[PDB]
Amino acid sequence: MASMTGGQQMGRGSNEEFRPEMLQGKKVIVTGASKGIGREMAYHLAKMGAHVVVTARSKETLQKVVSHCLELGAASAHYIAGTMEDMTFAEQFVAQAGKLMGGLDMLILNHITNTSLNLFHDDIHHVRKSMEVNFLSYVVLTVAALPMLKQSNGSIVVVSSLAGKVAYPMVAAYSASKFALDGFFSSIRKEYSVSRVNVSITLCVLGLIDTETAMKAVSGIVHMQAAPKEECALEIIKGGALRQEEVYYDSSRWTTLLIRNPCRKILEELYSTSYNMDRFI
Amino acid sequence: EFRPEMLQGKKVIVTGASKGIGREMAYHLAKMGAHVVVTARSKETLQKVVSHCLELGAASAHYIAGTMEDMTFAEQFVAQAGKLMGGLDMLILNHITNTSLNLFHDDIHHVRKSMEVNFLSYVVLTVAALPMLKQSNGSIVVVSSLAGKVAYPMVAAYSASKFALDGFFSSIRKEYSVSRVNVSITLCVLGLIDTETAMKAVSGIVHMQAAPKEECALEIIKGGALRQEEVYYDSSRWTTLLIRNPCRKILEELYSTSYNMDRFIN
Ligand SMILES: NC(=O)c1ccc[n+]([C@@H]2O[C@H](COP(=O)([O-])OP(=O)(O)OC[C@H]3O[C@@H](n4cnc5c(N)ncnc54)[C@H](OP(=O)(O)O)[C@@H]3O)[C@@H](O)[C@H]2O)c1
Ligand SMILES: NC(=O)c1ccc[n+]([C@@H]2O[C@H](COP(=O)([O-])OP(=O)(O)OC[C@H]3O[C@@H](n4cnc5c(N)ncnc54)[C@H](OP(=O)(O)O)[C@@H]3O)[C@@H](O)[C@H]2O)c1
Ligand SMILES: Fc1ccccc1Oc1cccn2c(C3(c4ccc(Cl)cc4)CC3)nnc12
Ligand SMILES: Fc1ccccc1Oc1cccn2c(C3(c4ccc(Cl)cc4)CC3)nnc12
């Protein structure tokens, strides 16, 4: 039947309004998918009938996510275990994932290095590791994924935080890595636009989410309402599917109303006329 | 309101001071009668900056040559600079790794080096300088860009490193506030400046008006001296009208009541 079937899900109002069928048969990578938001995303994609390749360090937990993804109705589900501290693993993982699915439609970059809320003093090793895992590996994964994503006119989904847009104490190294993602990915988005690289980039700005790990890390320190991980995971997928530049997800209505920076967008448009790139394309 | 006398006898470090904005800052500080320790890789060019700083009326002037790719050099440099001056009042973090305007493709080495030189060495320098800066109720001055606040194509690695500085230094500023660490942090958001290196890098690509390096250098020093959180310096009036993010400041204040830090300080 598939050989006698053809068409497009992305018609009028698909910019616009999400349908779970937009992910049916799509080839998706989810990093940091053994737990939390990442695991929830893998489950939503499975229910949508997507092909899924999940990664994290723990093979045992990834096995359970894969098994459950298959129960949920994933077109295919596989895992490749490894550390994102290793840039060779990050590069090879994408090639293997792409070969496992026969291509790539969406790259969901979600993993982070283990971090706790603490004042910054002298932990330069944690600052470096945060930059390596939360930022550099995302760049390595993007470079490795791009040829496949250009072929499919695919999507890059970058999971960030409110701490990647505004400042918070106790998360200096983490926040620096999240701000770096905005600078890097927002720059390449402008580059893709002029180079006719039809690969969308979604930066997801998340508030406090009720994941086991985050709840433990903020216990007795941060007294905020935590948003549900299930809904968070769906909002990220929706944003990627709709090719939205930015997703904002938080418990507070004040956040949603204030995080947006219309002045940044206006300034970027005003500077777009001040440079000549026809020598690079 | 700034007065040049605010820098008279002050003990100041200037990184990336062999040329451009950094060199201009060293010269302004010299004219103001500050004690100055300049750094960059080129000993020969630093020797000339030092000699000229002394002619201009610096209370004292020294150089220590080395690469900011080396975190051990960065750490030892501060100690050595503070021992020469007998302390530290202001740490001016200005150096960057060599960068050109290009589309991003494969260059992960340049992304890593940009993060190491433009960001990580600033953190290492701050850690090394903090005990002296706490003693003097001193200042940290971080030289950034409009590309460290808004997005630009052709500078992805550079921009990531500048955005990282905002996230890191703005976080520690809030930490210092609750810890009673009386060390100010000034993030300088600069537009196009007429430095030899920047002008060559943008030639035939960027055509906007370049602001003068002499005035730029002074505005950075002024901001540090006045303990301003942020300095905005650009040729365009539309930039000055738009760069500021009042909503970010409001959001930060609204979240400030949602957390309790008295377990890290008591
Ligand atoms: N939770 C929140 O409140 C919150 C707020 C804002 C933004 N976010 C963002 O949301 C994303 C997910 O957060 P979360 O709360 O869901 O975290 P989480 O539950 O703790 O999961 C993190 C995932 O990353 C993996 N991981 C950890 N170290 C790794 C390494 N070295 N190499 C590869 N994978 C590694 C973990 O699995 P293994 O340990 O087995 O490797 C796990 O699958 C992150 O980007 C986070 O910054 C979360
Ligand atoms: N110029 C502009 O249009 C502009 C715009 C926005 C922001 N900015 C910011 O302003 C600052 C200064 O810019 P500029 O135009 O004055 O640049 P510049 O003239 O090229 O000078 C950069 C300085 O950094 C030093 N440096 C380079 N690599 C180094 C390394 N590995 N270790 C230590 N020092 C190193 C250089 O000296 P040696 O080579 O001898 O080491 C030099 O003294 C930067 O932080 C930049 O981001 C400038
Ligand atoms: F998912 C995580 C696992 C382990 C550690 C941190 C993790 O991520 C987080 C855990 C908790 C809050 N997080 C935030 C926010 C935040 C940051 C600082 C403060 Cl004071 C308050 C709120 C913006 C909500 N960004 N990432 C995280
Ligand atoms: F000083 C430098 C030496 C070498 C390379 C970059 C250097 O720093 C720069 C050189 C030129 C412009 N720069 C900018 C601005 C910019 C960036 C990109 C584009 Cl398309 C337009 C305007 C914001 C003015 N930020 N840093 C630099």
Please report, for the domain that includes residue A205, its CATH number.
Answer: 3.40.50.720
Tell me, in angstroms, the distance from the centre of ligand 3 to residue A208's CA: 6
DSSP A168: -
Query: What does the longest C-alpha to C-alpha distance in chain A come to?
Result: 63
Shortest distance between the Cα of A46 and any Cα of chain B, in A, equals 32
Residues on chain A touching B157 (C-beta within 8 angstroms)? 184
Alpha helices in chain B (DSSP H): 20-31, 43-56, 71-85, 108-115, 121-136, 156-179, 196-202, 213-225, 237-242, 246-255
- CB distance A90 to ligand 1 below 6 Å: no
Range 220-279 of A in CB contact (< 8 A) with B: 220-224, 254-255, 258-261, 263-264, 266-268, 270-271, 274-277, 279
Could you tell me the two tokens for A275?
A: 């440079």
Assigned domain for A33 exists: yes
Please check whether residue B161 is in contact with residue B147, taking contact to mean a CB–CB distance below 8 angstroms: no
Q: B20-31 and B213-225 helices cross at what angle (nearest 10)?
A: 60
Q: How far apart are CA B161 and CA B258, in angstroms?
A: 29
CA A199 to chain centre: 14
Exposed (0-12), middle (13-18) or buried (19+): which is B72, by Cβ within 10 Å?
exposed
DSSP B259: B
Is the Cβ pair A258, B265 closer than 8 Å? no
**SS3 category, A65:** helix
- Region for residue A265 given its phi and psi (left: phi exceeds 0; alpha: psi -120 to 50; beta: otherwise): alpha
Is the Cβ pair A280, B161 closer than 8 Å? no
**Helix (H) or strand (E) segment spanning residue A107:** strand A106-109
The residue range of the domain holding B44 is: 1-266
Assigned domain for A10 exists: no
Shortest distance between the Cα of A79 and any Cα of chain B, in A, equals 26
CA A35 to chain centre: 14
Exposed (0-12), middle (13-18) or buried (19+): which is A32, by Cβ within 10 Å?
buried
Is the Cβ pair A254, B259 closer than 8 Å? no
Place of tokens 């290009």: B102
State which approach was used to obtain the coordinates: X-ray
Shortest distance between the Cα of B127 and any Cα of chain A, in A, equals 6
Shortest distance between the Cα of B70 and any Cα of chain A, in A, equals 13
How many separate domains does chain A show? 1
Residue with CA closest to ligand 3 atom 18: A168
Who contacts B249 (Cβ-Cβ below 8 Å, separation ≥6)? none
Among B232, B241, B240, residue whose Cα is nearest residue B186: B232
CB atoms within 10 A of CB A49: 16
Q: How far apart are CA B247 and CA A37, in angstroms?
A: 27
Q: How far apart are CA A38 and CA A230, in angstroms?
A: 10
Assigned domain for A14 exists: no
CA A169 to chain centre: 24
Assigned domain for A13 exists: no
**Helix (H) or strand (E) segment spanning residue A129:** helix A124-131
CA distances to A260, A262, A264, A270 from B242, in Å:
14, 9, 7, 10
Could you tell me the two tokens for A161?
A: 């935080």
**Helix (H) or strand (E) segment spanning residue B139:** strand B139-145
Please check whether residue B221 is in contact with residue B24, taking contact to mean a CB–CB distance below 8 angstroms: no
Q: How far apart are CA A114 and CA A111, in angstroms?
A: 10
Please check whether residue B118 is in contact with residue B96, taking contact to mean a CB–CB distance below 8 angstroms: yes
Assigned domain for A1 exists: no
Please check whether residue A27 is in contact with residue A50, taking contact to mean a CB–CB distance below 8 angstroms: yes
Range 98-137 of B in CB contact (< 8 A) with A: 102-106, 108, 111-112, 115, 119-120, 123-124, 127
- Name the closest residue on chain B to residue A185, using Cα atoms: B156
- CB distance A200 to ligand 1 below 6 Å: no
Where in the sequence numbering do the catalytic residues of A fall? 174
Is the Cβ pair B179, A139 closer than 8 Å? no
Residues on chain A touching B239 (C-beta within 8 angstroms)? 267
**SS3 category, A201:** strand
**SS3 category, B136:** helix
Is the Cβ pair B205, A128 closer than 8 Å? no
- CB distance A239 to ligand 3 below 6 Å: no
CA distances to A257, B20, B206 from B39, in Å:
45, 13, 29
Who contacts A187 (Cβ-Cβ below 8 Å, separation ≥6)? B104, B147, B151, B152, B153, B154, B155, B156, B159, B160
Exposed (0-12), middle (13-18) or buried (19+): which is A273, by Cβ within 10 Å?
exposed
Please check whether residue B127 is in contact with residue A122, taking contact to mean a CB–CB distance below 8 angstroms: yes
Assigned domain for A153 exists: yes
Among A88, A100, A214, A230, residue whose Cα is nearest residue A163: A214
Ligand 4 atom having least distance to the Cα of B197: 3
Who contacts A92 (Cβ-Cβ below 8 Å, separation ≥6)? none
Q: How far apart are CA A188 and CA B130, in angstroms?
A: 36
- CB distance B197 to ligand 4 below 6 Å: yes
First-to-last alpha carbon distance for chain B, in angstroms, is 35
Assigned domain for A237 exists: yes
Please check whether residue A205 is in contact with residue A247, taking contact to mean a CB–CB distance below 8 angstroms: yes
Range 131-190 of B in CB contact (< 8 A) with A: 146-157, 159-168, 170-175, 177-179
Strand pairing category for A76-81 and A51-56: parallel
**Helix (H) or strand (E) segment spanning residue A96:** helix A87-101
Among B126, B91, B90, residue whose Cα is nearest residue B10: B90
Assigned domain for A2 exists: no
Partner-chain residue, chosen from B108, B204, B245, that has the shortest CB–CB distance to A140: B108
DSSP labels, chain A: -GGG----S--TTTTT---GGGGTT-EEEESS-SSHHHHHHHHHHHHTT-EEEEEES-HHHHHHHHHHHHHHT-SEEEEEE--TT-HHHHHHHHHHHHHHHTS-SEEEE-----------SS-HHHHHHHHIIIIIHHHHHHHHHHHHHHHHT-EEEEEEEGGGTS--TT-HHHHHHHHHHHHHHHHHHHHHHHHT---EEEEEEE--B--HHHHHHHTTTB--PPBPHHHHHHHHHHHHHTT-SEEEE-S-HHHHHHS--HHHHHHHHHHTTSB--TTT-
Q: How far apart are CA B140 and CA B142, in angstroms?
A: 6
- From the annotation, which residues of B make up the binding site? 16-42, 67-68, 94-96, 145, 158-162, 193-197
**Helix (H) or strand (E) segment spanning residue A181:** helix A172-195
